[PDB]
Design a protein around this ligand. Structure first.
Ligand SMILES: CC(=O)N[C@H]1[C@H](OC[C@H]2O[C@H](O[C@H](C)[C@H](N)C(=O)O)[C@H](NC(C)=O)[C@@H](O[C@@H]3O[C@H](CO)[C@H](O)[C@H](O)[C@H]3O)[C@H]2O)O[C@H](CO)[C@@H](O)[C@@H]1O
Ligand SMILES: [Ca+2]
Length: 142
């Protein structure tokens, strides 16, 4: 029924080497995007994650999949943004994933036309002040 949108590239303002952003769109729920393990800085958060499609595309909802074992980096408070040209970004919604260990779905009020999505991760679960991590990020159209 629903169509999954292909993520072709992305960026992360913080990553641990070997755990860069593309590990969250490789289709494998065991591989992780993971922010830098050096999480002691006062300005460590927020962490900004950008997911890019090939072209502007119709999108109706997204699903964030946290790591399915371990508690380091489960998203908590975020701002979700998107962009129609990959450069200029528009606030979509504030979403609090609550540090949940299960998938978090966000359904948009209306279909949006996006080439890119961006997550401003303000907080995340884990040791110390927390981390940001993601097993898979998915985007769908109805
Ligand atoms: C024993 C020790 O050094 N404890 C310190 C504590 O370490 C936090 C650390 O604990 C576990 O890791 C151990 C060091 C060891 N490698 C192990 O496997 O037991 C956690 N691993 C597991 C499987 O539970 C570590 O989780 C990892 O953390 C990474 C980020 O650092 C990343 O998120 C990985 O994905 C994740 O598996 C981690 O929790 O740290 C405290 C304070 O920070 C210190 O006081 C202890 O001495
Ligand atoms: Ca993955």
């Amino acid at each position: 029924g629903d169509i999954k949108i292909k993520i072709v590239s992305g960026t992360a303002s913080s990553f641990q080497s070997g755990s860069n952003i593309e590990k969250s769109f490789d289709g494998d729920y065991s591989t992780l995007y993971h922010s830098s393990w050096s999480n002691g800085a006062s300005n460590y958060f927020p962490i900004t994650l950008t997911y890019n499609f090939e072209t502007v595309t119709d999108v109706d909802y997204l699903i964030y999949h946290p790591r399915n074992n371990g508690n380091n980096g489960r998203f908590k408070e975020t701002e979700i943004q998107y962009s129609a040209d990959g450069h200029t970004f528009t606030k979509l919604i504030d979403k609090d994933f609550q540090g949940s260990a299960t998938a978090g779905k966000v359904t948009f009020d209306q279909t949006i036309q996006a080439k890119s999505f961006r997550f401003i991760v303000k907080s995340g679960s884990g040791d110390g002040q927390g981390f940001a991590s993601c097993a898979e990020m998915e985007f769908f159209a109805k």
